[PDB]
Symmetry: C3
Subunit: 121 residues, 3 copies
């Protein structure tokens, strides 16, 4: 049994340096938030990028933090009018028996605006 | 162990009202067809939309039926010439030991044309 | 518990005959490399294609080798400048307890250039 973990983060520019940094930061925070101890717990990680980000592969950033042995895939997000620009989204598939309500999803920088429900009191 | 569940549905127009309704209908029918009792059985749900649908996020529709705690991701489908227009596709990842041939895939409206094998006698 | 299996292959032209052949070849090699004995071991398979490939659905090729009962989904890859053209990527989600370092990822034709780490001595 598997639990997905969602993440999202924004960048201010379509450059590799920006995209790679943001992706590394988000991945590490997703793992930390969930108490993951090894990349071996990850079945796979899927990324999406908005259409305004073409300069870099998020999987390259994941390999900068050593995710060579984690299977990675990336795709393009739907360009909805008025939706948040320059977003990197992550779906990590985690081999765990953690209950669904104990999985922690991580939305950073302006991406917090995507999920106001995940703000809490 | 995990089983994917596929769904697909068409809409007649690229509007949020159409996309959201179709997505809600399809998701509920996928769950019902498979005898799912809780959203907690879902590892994650991945959506795709054809390039002729940009007005809405399918994940927003999933949140209208309460999928806040289900990890969701969306992407764009390949624009193959002559392929069916205005299709919302769903891949639900289901934590189950159901055999592969007992999983029920759900193709609604004109999307039945995608999978004539799933028509039966 | 699930392990992803990555594959990738290139084609020389955007035609169905080329895309379908390459997809069939890659899928079978991914299964063989990992000692998979039944399609029932596959939770789902996700494909991506680069933006320069629109003539065919990789899932149609998977159905030419009988993957009707395997849930399939396809999406478009990020068009990064200078990245390899005409690539079909595969993420197979495999129900297995195989350790992460014993899963075999398969990169064929020019797609070997994507992952020089997977060349070995
Ligand atoms: Cl959370
Ligand atoms: Cl079925
Ligand atoms: Cl390998």
């Amino acid at each position: 049994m598997v639990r997905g973990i969602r993440g999202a983060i924004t960048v201010e520019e379509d450059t590799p340096e920006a995209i790679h940094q943001a992706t590394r930061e988000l991945l590490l925070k997703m793992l930390e938030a969930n108490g993951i101890q090894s990349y071996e717990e990850l079945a796979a990680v899927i990324f999406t990028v908005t259409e305004d980000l073409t300069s870099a592969f998020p999987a390259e950033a994941a390999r900068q933090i050593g995710m060579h042995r984690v299977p990675l895939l990336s795709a393009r997000e739907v360009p909805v009018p008025g939706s948040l620009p320059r977003v990197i989204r992550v779906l990590a598939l985690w081999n765990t028996d953690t209950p669904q309500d104990r999985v922690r999803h991580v939305y950073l920088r302006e991406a917090v605006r995507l999920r106001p429900d995940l703000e809490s009191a």
